[PDB]
From a paper:
Jawed vertebrates use U1A to bind stem-loop II of U1 snRNA (U1SLII) and U2B″ in conjunction with the leucine-rich repeat (LRR) protein U2A′ to bind SLIV of U2 snRNA (U2SLIV). Here, we report crystal structures of four states of dSNFRRM1 at 2 Å resolution or better: the free dSNFRRM1 (residues 1–96; dSNF1–96), dSNF1–96–dU1SLII, dU2A′–dSNF1–96, and dU2A′–dSNF1–96–dU2SLIV.
We used a 22-residue, blunt-ended dU1SLII construct to determine the crystal structure of a dSNF1–96-dU1SLII complex at 2.0 Å resolution. dU1SLII contains a 10-nucleotide (nt) loop (A7-C16) closed by a C6:G17 Watson-Crick base pair (to simplify comparisons between the various RNAs, we numbered them identically according to the provided scheme). As a consequence, C14 can adopt two alternative conformations.
Numbering used by the authors: 2 to 91
The structure:
Amino acid sequence: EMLPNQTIYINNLNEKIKKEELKKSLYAIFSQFGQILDIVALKTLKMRGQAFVIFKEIGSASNALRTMQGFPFYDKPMQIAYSKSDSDIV
RNA sequence: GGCCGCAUUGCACCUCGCGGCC
């Protein structure tokens, strides 16, 4: 099982949504959990449907993951895990 | 810049699947 990390990894995201909008919408629902350093969403073949939300505190990430797990975002239940590895900005 | 089709459920941190229309 994935250990806690201050970055959460989200997938099963609706790929039809433009990346800039996607990120603003994500910030709309995750900022309640604590300070966000950055949100990474790419639309490459490999990385579309996915995003990284990088919290300042690990406890924010844990709370965000547990609370928002499965929340239907642009119609699709978000799938949320901790990221495998630390995000670069540190 | 705007539409749309095919394929993709994928762990990233300098681009970066393919095709059609305006």
